[PDB]
Design a binder for this molecule. Structure first.
Ligand SMILES: COC(=O)[C@H](Cc1ccccc1)OP(=O)(O)[C@H](CC(C)C)NC(=O)[C@H](CC(N)=O)NC(=O)[C@@H](NC(=O)CC(C)C)C(C)C
Ligand SMILES: *[C@H]1O[C@H](CO)[C@@H](O)[C@H](O)[C@@H]1O
Ligand SMILES: *[C@H]1O[C@H](CO)[C@H](O)[C@H](O)[C@@H]1O
Length: 323
């Protein structure tokens, strides 16, 4: 049976996490994304100027076209990418997926044109929302999961330290105490779970649903919850140059917790200071608005507090405080 450890590294301020992936013998640095289901890469089909600063996939060297197949994906922040499809050998953490669909980029939006930190994305959401047309393809995980010792993966994302993606096994040294599991709703292709209640510092409220999303930087919550949280942060104000609510970097931030099948998942206030806001001299908050979508995005700010098991049996999510 197979298993492996893929090492992730955060970019500056932990904006995204990058993990090396070998595709047909070329290693690319990809953004592992439990919020989407596409494995797409910068490729030799992009204009040369857009290849600069990246490792790129050359499908002609090792890939096998999926004849007449295309892909086009659009993400929450407005970014997008599109192209055509080849199958190839894809190795993550020493685990090789043979005949894995690799989505070669022909077009990339401005955001990807300005991010030289990654060479594309490796989706880890359910394969049902893979965007390949006319028939969707399986993610790296779904391709290999019956070959793994257990059909799961697990993630430790850290603040300014390398972390792990564990494929096919649970590393019990990555958390304190025992895991608490909660059922997953995969009906929209996400690792969606329910929280029974929340605590935003000195205030608490009713539950909601959200998705475990390694591809999103922040913890995105309902505006009511954001407002409740920052009402407790002295001098907090919206700064559109920075991305949302900002505050003095020396601020002692309240904790944020959620109730998950009787387990309290707590994000310490220290992790809710995302980093210098950029423009001037404030820091950006790790909690921000979900734009009114009616569910929450449990992005990297939250994940840095937990070890999280993504188990296809169920499916279910397992949580415990990171160690
Ligand atoms: C259709 O699904 C997706 O796009 C999923 C899930 C989602 C659900 C509901 C709403 C938004 C997103 O998002 P994702 O995690 O695959 C996707 C991947 C990214 C590389 C583009 N992330 C995002 O779109 C999110 C925003 C979001 N959720 O609306 N993007 C980010 O967090 C971006 N972060 C910043 O700009 C940093 C700044 C916030 C300090 C990104 C560069 C990583
Ligand atoms: C993950 O699990 C497999 C199966 O036991 C091992 O072979 C591998 O070394 C790693 O521990
Ligand atoms: C990724 O790298 C880190 C340290 O180099 C981990 O220890 C893993 O085993 C992977 O090799």
């Amino acid at each position: 049976a197979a298993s492996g450890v893929a090492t992730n590294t955060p970019t500056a301020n932990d904006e995204e996490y990058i993990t090396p992936v070998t595709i047909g013998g070329t290693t690319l640095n990809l953004n592992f994304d439990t919020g989407s289901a596409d494995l797409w890469v910068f490729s030799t089909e992009l204009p040369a100027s857009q290849q600069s600063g990246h490792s790129v996939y050359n499908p002609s060297a090792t890939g096998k076209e999926l004849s007449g197949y295309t892909w086009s994906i659009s993400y929450g922040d407005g970014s997008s990418a599109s192209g055509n499809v080849f199958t190839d050998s894809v190795t993550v953490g020493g685990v090789t997926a043979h005949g894995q669909a690799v989505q070669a980029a022909q077009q990339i939006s401005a955001q990807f044109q300005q991010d030289t930190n990654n060479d594309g994305l490796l989706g880890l959401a359910f394969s049902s929302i893979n965007t390949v047309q006319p028939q969707s393809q399986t993610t790296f995980f779904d391709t290999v999961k019956s070959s793994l010792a257990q059909p799961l993966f697990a993630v430790a994302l850290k603040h300014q330290q390398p972390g792990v993606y564990d494929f096919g096994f649970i590393d019990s040294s990555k958390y304190t105490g025992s895991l608490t599991y909660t059922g997953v709703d995969n009906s929209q292709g996400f690792w969606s779970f329910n929280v029974d209640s929340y605590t935003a510092g000195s205030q608490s409220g009713d539950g909601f649903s959200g998705i475990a999303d390694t591809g999103t930087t922040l913890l995105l919550l309902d505006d009511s919850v954001v407002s409740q949280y920052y009402s407790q942060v002295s001098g907090a104000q919206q700064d559109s140059n920075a991305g949302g609510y900002v505050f003095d970097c020396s601020t002692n931030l309240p904790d944020f917790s959620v109730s998950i099948s009787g387990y309290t998942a707590t994000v310490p206030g220290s992790l809710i200071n995302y980093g210098p806001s950029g423009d001037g001299s404030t820091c950006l908050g790790g909690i921000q608005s979900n734009s009114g979508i009616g569910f929450s995005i449990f992005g990297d700010i939250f994940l840095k507090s937990q070890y999280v098991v993504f188990d296809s049996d169920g499916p279910q999510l397992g949580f415990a405080p990171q160690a």
